[PDB]
């Protein structure tokens, strides 16, 4: 339920300056 599928998949490939902040750059690593 936390985050969304599209947000998680958008936090998987880009992990650099263009991370778009939001919940994608949030604490997705380490749960």
């Amino acid at each position: 339920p936390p985050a969304t599928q599209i947000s998680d998949l958008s936090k998987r490939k880009p992990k650099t300056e263009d991370f778009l902040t939001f919940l994608c750059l949030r604490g997705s690593p380490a749960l």
Partner: protein
């Protein structure tokens, strides 16, 4: 056990695709603002004279310029357009690998 299939993608191509994806995302805001299936283009309006104004979108050579009045220019600050509705000839420049003639070569027929 069985011999390794030796996937054809390898890691050099994966690195190239990752770099291209980062550049495209930062350029077009496809993932964040485009909802994953649309491209967001920003216009540029400075001054307009009434006898109409021409606006150029930030992604070059993708959408042709148009003439609009002051109110239309104000209301047209941002534009979102599906990738299916993009012009077919001009959508190929968004990525060199969107479509490329692999055997460019010569001769043939």
């Amino acid at each position: 056990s069985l011999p390794r299939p030796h996937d054809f993608f390898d890691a050099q191509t994966l690195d190239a695709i990752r770099h291209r994806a980062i550049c495209f995302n930062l350029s077009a805001h496809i993932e964040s603002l485009g909802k994953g299936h649309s491209v967001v283009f920003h216009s540029t309006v400075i001054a307009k004279r009434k006898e109409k104004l021409l606006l150029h979108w930030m992604p070059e050579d993708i959408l042709p310029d148009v003439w609009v009045n002051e109110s239309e220019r104000h209301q047209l600050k941002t534009k979102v357009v599906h990738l299916s509705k993009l012009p077919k000839d001009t959508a190929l420049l968004l990525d060199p690998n969107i479509y490329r003639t692999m055997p460019q070569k010569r001769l043939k027929r």
